[PDB]
């Protein structure tokens, strides 16, 4: 069960810029050749977003170290991560992140997504452990590193995977009306963010933490190593804010262009006319 995988501190706050990325179809209603203006929780243009290094290696000098933080969800979250290796499996969203309240668990595996809203006693350092089943001759995944006790399940949703050269994955999370609304676009490496699912979970979402997968390290006799290491991983988190946007829909319905009206006086002039 729970592994006590703490490093001294998240010392550097890493930042970057969200040039034009967080534009999500705010409604599912098809419109054609139109200029629809909406006030909604968008990612502001040229916002300063944060680069998180979750698994960040120490060169020839040292082995890797682990800094996966619990983060606020505030009013919304733009998530982004371009990764070759299935290290980022999902997220946990919730309030207390212990039993006292319920919380949301989103874990994506090679066959399926599992989405759960249930009272989880989350381990203080959370991950999904992948181990070798000698009989099967395949590696298999254990969820009990994430949660040690499961109680009071109201929601279970199992479906086809989303997160599964480098393939940028972009996500927008909202929790409004008791409805966890998820928007997603994958990009192999201007682009519409197209809705994934609206889950009726009906819970308070105030904070979240990324879910990471750590292969078991079958150590030789003398190592003092953790026993849980898997590749390297990094991700980008930004926060949605209330904004009026002018979205331009195609003849085919596609959002070809959008403008943040509060960014600069020119964008306001395009907005008013």
């Amino acid at each position: 069960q729970c592994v006590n995988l703490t490093t001294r501190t998240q010392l550097p706050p890493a930042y970057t810029n969200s040039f034009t990325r967080g534009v999500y179809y705010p409604d599912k209603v098809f419109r054609s050749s139109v200029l629809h203006s909406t006030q909604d929780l968008f990612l502001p243009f040229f916002s300063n977003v944060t680069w998180f290094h979750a698994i960040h290696v120490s060169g020839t000098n040292g082995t890797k170290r682990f800094d996966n933080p619990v983060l606020p969800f505030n009013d919304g979250v733009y998530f982004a991560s371009t990764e070759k290796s299935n290290i980022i499996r999902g997220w946990i969203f919730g309030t207390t992140l212990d039993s006292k309240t319920q919380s949301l668990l989103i874990v994506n595996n090679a066959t399926n997504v599992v989405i759960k809203v249930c009272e989880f006693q989350f381990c203080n350092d959370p991950f999904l452990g992948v181990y070798y089943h000698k009989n099967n001759k395949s590696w298999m995944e254990s969820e009990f590193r994430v949660y040690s006790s499961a109680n009071n399940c109201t929601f279970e949703y199992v479906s086809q995977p989303f997160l599964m050269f480098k393939n940028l994955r972009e996500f927008v999370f909202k929790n409004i009306d008791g409805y966890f609304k998820i928007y997603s676009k994958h990009t192999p490496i201007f682009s519409a963010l197209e809705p994934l699912v609206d889950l009726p979970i009906g819970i308070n979402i105030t904070r979240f933490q990324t879910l990471l997968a750590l292969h078991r390290s079958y150590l030789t006799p003398g190592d003092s190593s953790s026993g849980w290491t898997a590749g390297a991983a990094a991700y980008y988190v930004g926060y949605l804010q209330p904004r009026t946007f002018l979205l331009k829909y195609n003849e085919n319905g596609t959002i070809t262009d959008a403008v943040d009206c509060a960014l600069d006086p020119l964008s306001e002039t395009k907005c008013t006319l």
Partner: antibody, heavy 121, light 110 residues
Framework: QVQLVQSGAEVKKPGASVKVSCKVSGYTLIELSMHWVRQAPGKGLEWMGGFDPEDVETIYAQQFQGRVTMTEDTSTDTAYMELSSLRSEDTAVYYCATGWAYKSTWYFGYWGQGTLVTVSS | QSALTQPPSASGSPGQSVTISCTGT?????????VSWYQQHPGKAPKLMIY???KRPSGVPDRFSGSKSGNTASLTVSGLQAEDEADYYCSSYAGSRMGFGGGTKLTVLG
């Protein structure tokens, strides 16, 4: 690290049957293959049998055919080894050892303290 | 049991280097690189010293190193210190079986 703790020593008479346990800690039984060897007084190590990682099938050495039987219980994390038709030659210390299954590098990294089976009428 | 051939004793003055050889066939030591080496102090359970032919587990000092040539492997113990007086057992996969071989007693000569 993995830690292997065996059953206490036992005394038997010729013709009897003996069963030795082996409790594994630190890593669960389904992640590491189990092999049993024995050492007679002063003599060398002799492989009794083990588990083939690539071909999932316990392997028994030619010496102990239809006479040894090795079983594992994954829930209790305990490995078992039953030897029937005991005779004075079987008087030895019996070690349970372990090698990783993924790599299959046939290196018995970790050993039990040993179980002394003493056969004498 | 006795599948691999390995000498009865190994003499060495302290500080010197000793080499214990483990001789097999093309089907056990000559066919694979799955050779291993084990120390054993008297009345005490064995201990791994060399894994995968040349590799060494941590905590084992630098002075132990092994290799193989043709059908014969060998363990070499330099910087002889009295902690090394023990029996030394080699081991290797035979394709269907894993068989330890004989013994050898380093005798730190005093």
């Amino acid at each position: 690290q993995v830690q292997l703790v065996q059953s206490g020593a036992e005394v038997k008479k010729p013709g009897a049957s003996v069963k030795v346990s082996c409790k594994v800690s630190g890593y669960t039984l389904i992640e590491l293959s189990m092999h049993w060897v024995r050492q007679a007084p002063g003599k060398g190590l002799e492989w009794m049998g083990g588990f083939d990682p690539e071909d999932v099938e316990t392997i028994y050495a030619q010496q102990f055919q239809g006479r040894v039987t090795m079983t594992e219980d994954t829930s209790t994390d305990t490995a078992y080894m039953e030897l029937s038709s005991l005779r004075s030659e079987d008087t030895a210390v019996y070690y349970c050892a372990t090698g990783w299954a993924y790599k299959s590098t046939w290196y018995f990294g970790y050993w039990g303290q040993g179980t002394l089976v003493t056969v004498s009428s | 049991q006795s599948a691999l051939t390995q000498p009865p004793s190994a003499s060495g003055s302290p500080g010197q280097s000793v080499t214990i050889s483990c001789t097999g066939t093309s089907s056990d030591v000559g066919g694979y690189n799955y050779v291993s080496w084990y120390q054993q102090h008297p009345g005490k359970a064995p201990k791994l010293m060399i894994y995968e032919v040349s590799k060494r587990p941590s905590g084992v000092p630098d002075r132990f190193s092994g290799s193989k040539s043709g059908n014969t492997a060998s363990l070499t113990v330099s910087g002889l210190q009295a902690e090394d007086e023990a029996d030394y057992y080699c081991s290797s996969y035979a394709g269907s079986r894993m068989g330890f071989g004989g013994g050898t007693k380093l005798t730190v000569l005093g």
